[PDB]
Structure formats: C-alpha cells, structure tokens
C-alpha cells in the first residue's frame, strides 16, 4: 500500500472519488433536497467542455485574472420550476442521455435565499471511462 | 448650549451633564454597549457618564473656553444602565454618540474614539465591549466584504458540500521542491484548497517570489491534470506596506484566484486598504485571525466574539478565520454559532439570549464565509457537518499531512470522508448517531479511509457548549 | 536531524523534542521570556515546549512528511524555566529561536510567529510577555526611530528645560476660527507645542485639509510674532492607508514641522512604513499610544510596559506618548521609569530588579522622547521635574484651556511655572519640598500664576509607587 | 417569490404584482413622489404600478425565465396614491424602491433608473417629479457640497 | 457580417439577475440565433454584483458564444457610472481585453462625457453604441422644447 | 573623551591615542587584518595606530576643534600586532572599528574608509589586506547573493553532476546567424550553458538587441528539440548605467533564464543595484571577474584571494568566476580551494592554516556557485572532478569550439566525458588513476570522444599547488 493516481480516467469533481450512485439513491437524495427547499435543474456538458481549461487566455490581454473556461454546463430544456416530480427528472435524464452519447449529464440545484447554486451528483455519459 | 457658554471654573457633575436615561435615539446615532466594573467608591452612573464625557468632550478643568464648541445635540449621551447577574460590581453601560462627532467611515478615528480613549481610565477596574449600533450611513461609508458569499459561490464555480482543505506544516522552512511535491500531491488527492502559514511564505534564504513560482507550476497542473476546480491560499505576510504592495502586485501579474492575508494581525487600515484594492481588481480575499488568548478571550476585561465578528465584517473579507476546535482558536457552541451567524446572515433583530443589544440596519450587506482549521479529522466529521452544514472551508491540521500512506491517500481519505458524510447528509440521516457506522461502512472499500481510521482511532471529541475564555 | 526522518504516526512529547535546558545561545538567536499559568492538569514543561513547538513547526499528527523539513539548529527551543513567587501555578518560560526561522526584519511575520500563534492555546489559562532578546542583525533590519533624541535635539533648535505644551480640548467639534484663535493665543502666551486629538483633525463638514490651512495661517504668525521657536503636533488620523498617504503628501507641499500619529493604534506596519517615509523626508515623528486598560494593564494575562517600550522603539518614533498621570494612561513610579529608561538610553545590561531578562545589543540605536499629558498642573510641576528632569514634552489638559482669563494667561501661567521650576532646579534646590514656596514666591507678580494657583489650589497629587493594573 | 417561479406565458396585471397600498417603508428605502395624468382608458393604479414595474423589472411578454431573478423584497413597489384637486385626470403617485436595486452612490444609474426609463411612456400624457426620499445611507454615498455654508463662512474670511 | 438587419434582444428582468443565470441566458440566446444582446442600467452593476465580475462572466460566455456556434456575435455592455473616474475605470479595464461593441448612457449623464468617450473610442479603434432616454421631458415637448430632428442633429 | 576636550596645539603621538592591544571587540565591531611593511624609521605600532587614526578621525595639527566630536567608544582602535615570518620588515596589523563610524550597509563609505583612504600613505611601502570581520548586522544590511546556492539548485531544475558549458570565441565580431548556428549546434550536442564575452555582446554594426533575438530564436529549440533544460549566459556589458538598465529591462519582457554581467569589473554599486533588481524580478545572476594581474595577484602590495572572495560575496552573485586553469585567471590548489570554500559554505570558525584571521557570523548567509573557464579539456576532466566534485559550472575554452568535426560532436564529446567521469565517480573509482582508462573505455563508441583524445593528445596537466603571483 498505496499506489494513488486516477488511471485512464480522471476525477470529475464532487462524487467522483466514491463509487457511482444509482437512480434510486439519486431519487431519494433529490426528494430530500426538494424537502429542504433547494430547486433542481438538469444540465449537460460536452466531454472537452466539462473539463477545466485556460486556452481562451490566448484571445485576452490580462490573464489569469480569476478567468476560467470549459466548466459551463448547458441546461436540459427547463429548470424544475413548479412541478418537482423525480420521475419526470428521471425520464428527462434518459432523454438527455439518448440525445448525447459524447456529453456528460449532471444535476444541480439552487437555494433562492441567497440565490446560490449547488453542483451535485453525478457525472455520467454512455461512453463513461474506467471505474476506480 | 449650541455654543457660547461662560462656564464657571471647575468640573460639573457628569450625571448632571452626560446622563439621559430618557433619551430618544436618532437613525444616524452610533451606540455602544459595555460591561464594566468601577474601582471601589465610584458610583456606576458617575463612571458611565465619565466614560461618555471623556470619549466625547473631555475635561480636567472646564471654563468659558469649553463654551467655544457646540455641545447641544452634538455631545455623547449615557443612557439607562443595568447590573450584571454574575458579579455584583459588574454593570452594563449604554452610550450614544451622534454622527456629527466622527469622520465618515474613518476606521482609526472611530477605533481611537470608541476603544482607544474609552479603554484606559484608572478608576475603572475592568471594561468589556458587549455590542455596537452602527447606523446605515456609517455602514455604507464603510465598504464591507469585497466579494462576499453570494458573489463567492458563483466565482469559485463549485459548491454543494463543504470546501475541503489543509493547513501546510511544518511551519519551519520546508524546501521549495518538497513543498511543491506536498502541495501537488494533496491537491491531486482530492483537496479543494491548501493553505500557507506565516513562516511558509518567506525565510532568510528563500523569497516568497520563488515559493510562488513553485505554486504556479503546481496549481496549473493541479487543475489541468485533475479536471476539477481547485487552488491554493497564499498567505502573503510582510514587514512593511511597500513589501505588502510588492507581494500584491507581483501576484496580480499572474492573477491567481483566492488568496489570504494575516495583514489583519499587522494592522486594521492595512486590511481595509487591501479589501478596497481586492474590490478594485476583482479578487477573492481570505482574512486570517489570531491572538486568541490576549484579544478574543478577554473575559470580563475587553474584547468579545460578537463585537469581533461585527468589527471584522465592518472592515470586510470574503473568507474569515475561525475556530481550530482544539489548540489555538475557539471550539465552543455558545461562542462559534453567534459568531458565524453575524458573518453569514443579514436582516435580523437584536436578542439578549444571543448577547445582541443593538441592530445595525441591514439589507444589501454581503455574507462572509468562516474558515475552520481543523485539528481533529475522521470521527469528528459527523458532529462538524451536523453543527455547521455547508458553512466552511475546513482546512485540516491532522488530516492529509498525518497519513503514513502520503499526501495523496491522506487527501483522498479526507475527500472520501467528506463525500461519504455528504451522502449520509443528503439521505437526511441522524448524523450524530449514524456517523460512526457510516465511517465503518465507508472503510469497507475505501482502503485509504480504512487506513485513516486505524491511524486516527483515538480521537473522538465533539464540541463543548459553554465559553472557555 | 537535518532531514530524512521516517516518523511513525502520533504527536511526540514536546519535552523530548523542543526542550533543551543545556542549550547555549548564538549571537543571531532571538529569545523570548514569558510569564505563564497552565490549565489545571497541564505540566509547565509540556506547555513551554508546546509553545516552542507550535511557533516553530506545529502538529496535530506527525508522520514521515514532517521529516521533510530540516529540523536541527533551525527549530525553536525551550530553555530552563523558573517558578514565580506570586502564585503556585505561575512560571517564567524562556524560548529561543534561530535567525533562520523568520524573514529579515519582517514585523507581521515576527509578530504572528511570536504573539499570534503563541497567545491562543486553550490549555493555557494566562500568558504574559516579560522580555525579548533581539539580536543585532534583526535590530538593524528593523529601522528604529527615524530622527530620535540625538537628532531631534539639534533639529528643534531649542532645549535646556522641558518642552511645554497642551492637548486641545473639547475633543468634540470645535470650529476652525475658534480653534485657530485658541491655538494662536496659547502658543503666543508661552507654550512650545500644542496637540490635536483624533476627532479634532476632521469632522463631517470640516476637512483636515481646511483645518490645516487655518493651522498654516496661524502658525506662520505664532512663530513670527513671538520670536521663539514653537509649533503644533497635527494628528493626522485616517481610515485607510490611501487617506494616510494623502494626508502625508499634501502636508509635504507646505513641509510643516513636527506632527504625530495614532497610526500605531491602527497597526505596526503602517507606522513602520511612515517611519521610513519620515526618515526619507527629513521629518520629526511623534507617536501616539492608547488602549491602556486592554493592552498596557494586562496583569498576568498579556502585554506589559517594558515589552511595550521595546516593541514601540523597535518600530520607532522620535517622540512617544506615555502617562497622563491621572485618568486614561499610567502615573505610577514603578511603571513609568523603566518604560522611559528603555526609550531614552542605549548600551545597558539586563537586571531582574528592573524586570529585564534579556539584553538586545545596543550601540547606535537612537533614543525616543516621552510625551506626558498632563491632567494636573501647577503644584505637580516640582514632582514631575524631580522624577523626570528634562525628559518631556509635557502636554497639559488642566492647564491653559482651564484658566478663566483665557488661553494666553493660561499658557503664560504654565510657562511661568515651567521656568520657575527650572530656575529652582538650576539653583540646585531641594525641589520636592521647596517647590510649593517657589511657586508661591513667583505669584507675587505674575498675576496669571496667582490666578492659576487660586483656581488649581486642591491638586497636590504626586505619583503612587506600586503598579495599578 | 425569491426566485424559481414558473410563470404562464403572457403579461400579468401590474396592479396584482407591483402595487401594494399597505406597504411599510424601510429606513434604507428610496422613494419618489410623482404628479401624473394617464392617457385616456388607462386606470391610475395601472399607471402607477406600470411605472414601478418598468423602473424595477420590465416586460413585454413574461414566461418562466422572468422567474430567474429574486423578485421578493428586491422589487420596486407603488404605494397608495391620491387625486390632485386642480385637474380631474391628475394624481400623485408614491413609488418605493429597496436599496438592493441601485448601485451605491451612482448618479447615472440612479438618474437613468428614476428619470431616464420613467419619463418616456406613450401611455403617459404628462408626468412631473414632485419629491424624493433619499435614505441616509445613499445621502452619505452621494458626495454632496465640497465646502458648503459652514465651511465657506470661515474660508472667505 | 452584413446583408440583413442585426438581430438582438434587450435583457430583462432589469432587477438584479445572478451571474450564473445571466450567463446561462446570454449563452443560450446567442447560441440559438441572436447577433447582439443588450444590458440595462441596473443589469450593469448592483450592490452585491460588480460590473467587473459581470464582465468576467460575459467574457467566458462570449468566447464560447462565438466559438461553439461558428458565427460572429456579441453583447452590448451598458457601462453606466456615478463619477467620471468610475467611467474611465469601466473603459480602461475592458480596453485590456479589447472586447467588441459596447453601449453607454453616458449621454443621459452628460454631453461632454460622451464627446470625450467618442474621442477615446476613436483612439482605441473600438465601436460605440449610444443610448437614449427621457422621451417625455426631452423629445415630446410639443410647442415648448426639443424635437426629434434637432435631437438627431445634436446626437450626431 | 565623550566630547568637549580642548587639546593642546600640535600632534599627540598615535601610539598614545590610537593603540590599545588589550581591547575586547564588540559583536557589532568591524575588524580588519592587514599585512604591512613600513618605510624605514616608522615603528609598526606608529603605522598601525596612524592607519587607525587616519581612517577614523584624521589630523595634520590637532587643536580644541577636534574636541567638538564624541571620541570615547566611537573612534577606530589598533589592536595587538604580530610579525610576518617571511620578511624582517613585514608585520600583520589588526584594526578595530565600532559600528558608529560607518553608515548602515553603505558600500562606498565602508570601501572608501577602509581601503580608499588607507591604501595611499607615502611612508607606507606596501600594504596587503589579509582578512575582514564583517559583523552580522552589517552582513544583513548588505544584501548578499540574490538567488544563492540553496535557491539556485531548485531553480535550475537539474543537479547531480557538474554543469557543462563553453565560453564563446572568437571574441571578435562573429555575425549573428553564424553565432546562432554555433550556439544551437553546441547546445543540441549536449552543453548545459554557453557564455558570451564583452565584445560578443555589442559591436559597431551589430546591436546586443539583434544578437539577443538570435539567442531567443536558437534557445527556444535548444530546449524544445532536445527535451533537456539548457540555456545561454548573456554578458550584457555597457558604457553607462542607463545602457545597463536598458539591457536588463528589454530582456525582462521575455524573461530569459540565466544571464551574467561584468558590471563588477565596471563598478561595485552598479553590480549591487543590479543584484537587488535581479532579486526583485526573480531571475538568476552570474557574476564575471577579471583583472587578475593587477588585483588578484597583488603579492604583498594589495588585494588577496580570500578577501576578494569575501568582498565578492558581500556584494553578491548566484554564480561567480573562478580559475581558467591556464591563461588569464588562477589554477592553483592553495588559491582555489579557500576561495571556493568562502563562496560555497557557511558556519565555520577561523583557522590560521587556512589563512582565516576573522570569523564573520555565519547562520543564514547565502552560498554562491564557482564558474571555471576551462582552457584544457579531456584528460584534465578526471583531475578537475576529483578536486572539485559537483561544484561548477565548467565553461570550456578548448572543448566544443576546438573540435574539427563541428559544434555538435565537440559538445557531445564534452558531454560524453562529463557523463563518463560522473559514472566513474558514482562507481567510487580512484578517479585520478582510473580516469584515463575510463576515457579509453568510452572512446570505443563515442567516435566524438575518440577524435577529442587524438586532437588533445599532448595535454595531461593537473593543477599546480602553490600561489604563483
């Protein structure tokens, strides 16, 4: 003990250092997160657009200057305003998953008191690379 | 008198000149609440009034020349005072000052007037500051946090669980490539943010400039090779303001995200100027704090935590340091939770059960984020998460640099424990009682956490409740 | 070890790793002497060693990665410690640090290392700093007084008696033409130097800039019409360092004589940068001091007068404030005389009867001049002159602006009393017993002093001997 | 709502969203008093509410995306209004804004928000500004007179 | 790009929109079809949100809202301020990144402010969009003040 | 006298006023050891005392006006002196000065006082400087190396064998593209660092600016195409300080790694200011040295190697020049090894067998790296490695630009010999006798080294031992 290094695949942020969560675990945690007053949104990102970059610094004269790139996620049609049904979210995750094999799909939510967004579970795509 | 009074020689009774227990405050008035014990023989209203008189006007013999200034509505006023139940000679004094007496948002003038002049008197045995009313027109001429919690959440590009880190030790003198190796491995292992200490910044042989260049190589790859957003809090300490400005400007060239400074152990106006600069250059600013057994713990005899939290937020900072739990800073429920509430939240009235005697009106005041550090890891994560939630910015001192499998499995174990605790918290578990079994289950296959829990099998402390000043 | 130790997990006993009662110091070593009371159940050698360990290296779990740093001669060492006869749990701890651990002349790094980290611990009940050994290579990377006593004596163009003044009051809000009138009349009446308080400088309508223009108009004639060299100590206070620099630079344009600042109530590095600026611009710099009940008076629990005098002179100042006799700052014989001795003089060894535990080697360190202020006048001039001689810089607060015939006869009476005491002192009189009759003899025809001695006929106070904190 | 409202497609009546005749001001609130005559066919409470709505949020079709911002205590409010006893279609409107809506001590932002946006509308025949409540925290972040009357008296000698 | 009108949208709600929801709205509408979007006066700066950080979220969004679409597009920042020092600070920090076209209500603030900026814009080779406001108390003054043709001549 | 002595008209003997052989030095005192021969009829205590008197106070006839200054502990003192064994008229003088006499870290004041005034005297036949005691507080107000050996090892990113290079010749006039080709080829062949000479830098037609652009074009591929860290020492010489600063600042924009300057053949304060700038901009600085027959070789009449090494390090440099073996600079065992020890090392007390008469207090004094150049190659690599180890920075003059197969096989032969010697050193070989057979063993298949050993078949030289001044 102990060889530590992500082999062939990388650590895609929060909840990637633990074994993957199932849809039942995700739905139970969503139902709790909804109960606690957070508002979910379903979002997705291309594989080279979900992994942090600074290449765009080439266009700009003052860098690093807190600037970042390739961490922005695109929203799947609607945020969960009004209806909070987790099976609608699960069908939308499947529809998103069917639409993009090369892009990652993730859930995020916000606390409207300070209007702050939480980036949650789980980084997933049909072509998901090596398990740790 | 509004000016032009021919006062007879001597000193008039302070209870006949600076005491008004029927006073009606203005929205522009500055108020201060103090806990005091007079020397034996002096009436407490004579003492309270004398404190109000000396911090407003001052005298050692008054004649017609004291009639030259406009006194009327412009002089300080002592309001009704009360006894303290814990000690018979202790009283709470309440003093009002108008806006007319102070320069607008002037921190050394306010500090010298309110604390400097007041906390001196030889006929006063002990005096403790309990609260302050800062009117809106002085709050907004102050600047507050440059990039507070509702800014910092969108600026750091990540959030939804606590922010995981570690304090880099030994404090003495670690070589730049071995420091580069340790920082790289713990960030690549799963820490979000790492932190420097004062001696880690600069040493006789080694300049901050070159330590920073090893940080620059390390931070580029400690994002680039991991995908996840991470960084490192540079601590940036210095002897002169020219050196402070040089340290600022050379790191402006690289424009790194969040740094910290201990600058507010250096001086109040140094930190205020930096916060203005940080606002101007769009930074994020972490504020250090120390001197806990000579400032923060001034029992019945000076500074207290709630006034410290108000004073710290009324200079400003985006992150602010904050209990070590054990060792050198606070860890108590009746100390920390008020202190954090006064930093996190806006628009909330005064309450004597929370030791708040005054409300400073609120609305549009940024929040500021506590940074704890964090002397015990794995078994005290349940209580820490249940008490503080998604506050902190937890910079470990035992974790990471205490794991005999090295910095990456150390950081990975701390990261695994945070994610496992956050999964338990996401399921709504009864965390104080479930958390030991959550850790035992997590240890089945994270081997790194199993090693963390064999290595740290003697630490079980939670928090104490009652202040230990 | 110089590095390469494969330590097992845990925290090693500090008495076996940071305690060396056989150690002999180098000329480059920094030493500190502290008075301490541990929490009950804590060994004092564990506490002393733990303080030395935490200010050097620090640990909450040590493994092989703490073996990366070079420990050897580079780490802090706790020397042999002694009991105090004042209490059964009070001890004096002695801790040595090499030059290697701290950045060269770095005041926030030294302050944070020595005071910030150390004075926190929850297993420590109270800790007081008793002395410091500052080695010559850190004394000269410090800057000290820019224009201290051997410079200031030739720069002020006068000397041979004390320097006579007054503190301008009321503190509140005096309009510029009535302030101009009061300052002109008391300087033309006999005072050498007048002083502002923090609020006097700048108020909501009246800017420091316009107050300064009324000072310029008054000061030109308050030397020109009196022949004698005089001036006014401006105070100069500010909320931000940009405001401090603006205050400096606009008064560089008129290049005014001596000013003062509460900058060193603001912060150490602000004052250090200013002292360098004062060294650069050929100024003279007076240093203000306040917070006496929460800094200076910290009994067994923090800062003390001798360490304060060493710390104040190791940032620097040419004049420095100092006892009010009665009221807000000290007046005790066993407090003031040590404090002044550590400011005035050079090349002198340590003595336990004077509370000195360490000698900082001396030769070429300029002196710094105490400024007293001065709540009682006429009858206490004999004792003040007999105790302090031609030290001070005596700024009255009862005298001058307490005389019912106005600022000029007030100042004249204080000037007549200063010259009369100095003539008695020049005649080699038994001043402590003769001085009352010398003052009575003077009153025959100065009417101004006769009125001063009827108005102030009850103030006969001298000094108390033994400290009152 | 503090954010997250799934509004129906269209425009919702301003009198049910930006007009509150029982509102209680804060010490940090910015208020403006206006004398107005609506175009014929427009209710004066619709006009007051529309002025508060256009100076606060604005719309020309609202859907769920207007739910993205934190409306709650952060939006402008039209308080109770009164008739002018000199002309039948003239009214005095009272509009409150929280401190949250404007940049601190910013003269072109305050000017454009209060006068620029407001004094345009094709449904307004005439609109006159009658008074302003400037809260102390905006009065002191305004810079005001540099050397006013109590300074100028001593300065001119 | 030219051969048809320039397609855009005015960003609302005017109140106070948080930076990631603003970033999402701007990215999506530019990537969907728009050429240029515009901010209002309150969208530029708010107590909690600095123009400086709103600009940095615009920079991340605008780079990809050209790069991921393949078509030249941008966003009109509205630039508004309380003092001329604040106006110049707002100018100079966006000169560092030399972004394509912005707008200002500077000419609701003052005539000489806009004249000085137009010279600065000429010098730094930019492009300058000019705001207009106050239509009932300027433009609509029937027989008793300013009119549209004189306004167009004065503006040009 | 502390001041105020009315000395009688005339000259009092220096042996009765400036000679104190019982004196005990302070820790802050500056001490100097000199080897001297007086003119006939001048006592050596008169000469020592007169030197101390003229470097301290000076007189041509003393009267009461010399009484106007404070003399007491403030004047220079001549300590006990000893005979030189080599010559009947030679003596070693020891002279002490207090800290009070010289401005803090003032190099032209100290240089002019100690060397400038002293090394003039008509009645002194010859005077040679033998050692200096620089007290720690003057060592730390001096600036020393900008990026010393303990910084430079981690900054260059490569270490574990000597640093291989070559000195670029012909000095005349070589066109920039043929220079670019030669530099590229020798770096691609295996050199670590190349060096320019004074004429190579700038010529009437060819500007340093355009020579620098060919260095930039070459250097990008001379790292990029080889995968190994390498560079080129620009020499950067100039006629005015404005030109020196222009040469610095234009190459700061592209921030090239390591350069050198003969700035310290130009002027001491020019090099000191540049080293401060180099420290500020985080560079690395190589220092050139020349003038060996008129400075370094000054037999009994001036400068000597150990004082030169102390003086060079007390301005500072990161690398510093050092024997050519043959030709222009030293190659001797009793010259180089002391000189190198005084540059590399710290914390070592005085020994008369090593010519050390005075210890400057050590602890935190940056090291500085010897640069040899290096006229003879292949057969003298064993002896060089055996004498010096992994000091140097060996810049060849015969190697590379002496190989008739061109710059890449020249550099490759030197690189193969460096690695072969380092492998022999790693195997623990008896290198002085084994190295010849190691070179023969290497030659089987490196053809480049076989050609190197046919080309340089007559040079078998080691080093001479004794100083041949």
Author numbering:
A (entry chain J): 46 to 177
B (entry chain O), C (entry chain M), F (entry chain K): 7 to 475
D (entry chain I): 7 to 163
E (entry chain C): 164 to 319
Pull text from the paper:
As the most abundant protein, ribulose-1,5-bisphosphate carboxylase-oxygenase, commonly known as Rubisco, is indispensable for life on Earth as it catalyzes the reaction between CO2 and ribulose-1,5-bisphosphate (RuBP), resulting in the production of two molecules of 3-phosphoglycerate (3-PGA) in the Calvin-Benson cycle. In higher plants, algae, and cyanobacteria, the enzyme is a hexadecamer, consisting of eight large subunits and eight small subunits. The large subunits form the core of the enzyme where the catalytic sites are located, while the small subunits play a regulatory role, influencing the enzyme’s activity and stability. In the unicellular green alga Chlamydomonas reinhardtii, Rubisco is sequestered within a specialized non-membrane-bound organelle called the pyrenoid, located in the chloroplast.
Here, we present the native Rubisco structure inside the green alga Chlamydomonas reinhardtii determined by cryo-electron tomography and subtomogram averaging of cryo-focused ion beam milled cells. The best resolved 3D class (number 12) was refined to 8.1 Å resolution, enabling the identification of secondary structure elements. To better understand the reconstructed conformational state, we used molecular dynamics flexible fitting (MDFF, detailed in the methods section) to refine the published X-ray coordinates from purified C. reinhardtii Rubisco complexes within our map. Overlaying the class 12 MDFF coordinates with those of PDB 1GK815 resulted in a root-mean-square distance (RMSD) of 2.75 Å. An excellent match is seen at the center of the complex near the 2-fold axis and at the interior-facing parts of the large subunit. The MDFF structure is more extended along the 4-fold axis compared to the 1 GK8 structure, producing mismatches of up to about 4 Å between corresponding helices at the small subunits and nearby large subunit segments. In particular, the large subunit loop 6 (aa 331–338) and C-terminal (aa 461–475) cover the active site in the closed conformation, and both fold outwards and become disordered in the open conformation. Most strikingly, the positions of mobile loops 6 and 46–68 clearly cover the location of the active site, and map density is observed at this position up to high contour values. The N terminus is well accounted for in the map, while the C-terminus density is interrupted in the middle, around Glu468. The MDFF model positioned the end of the C-terminus in contact with the body of the complex within a strong peripheral density, correlating well with the location of the latch site. Class 12, which is in the closed state, is particularly different from the rest of the classes at this position and perhaps constitutes a more stable conformation.
